[PDB]
C-alpha cells in the first residue's frame, strides 16, 4: 500500500535518551529517563532497551 501506512515526513526510527538524573549506591545505581514519544507516534515497549 502506498499511503496511510508509512509517513512522508521527517521522522526518526531510533531515538537516543540521555539519563536525566543518575544516582549511585555502593551496590546499585538508578537511571531516570524521559521516554518522550512525539506527536502521531506509537512506541511498542518491546523495541525499548538499555
Amino acid at each position: 500500500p502506498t499511503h496511510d501506512v508509512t509517513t512522508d515526513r521527517s521522522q526518526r526510527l531510533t531515538l537516543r535518551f540521555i539519563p536525566v538524573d543518575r544516582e549511585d549506591t555502593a551496590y546499585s545505581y538508578k537511571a531516570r529517563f524521559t521516554l518522550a514519544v512525539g506527536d502521531n507516534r506509537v512506541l511498542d515497549m518491546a523495541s525499548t532497551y538499555f
Binding site: 500500500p1 499511503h3 496511510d4 501506512v5
Partner: peptide, 28 residues
C-alpha cells in the same frame, strides 16, 4: 481498513478476525 493492507492481487491481504488477543499462560 483495506488501504493499510497489502494487496495480493487486487484483494486486501487481511488477517483473521479472532486473532487479536493473546491467551497464553504458564500451562493454560
Amino acid at each position: 481498513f483495506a488501504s493499510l493492507a497489502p494487496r495480493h492481487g487486487s484483494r486486501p491481504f487481511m488477517g483473521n478476525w479472532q486473532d487479536i488477543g493473546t491467551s497464553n499462560m504458564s500451562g493454560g
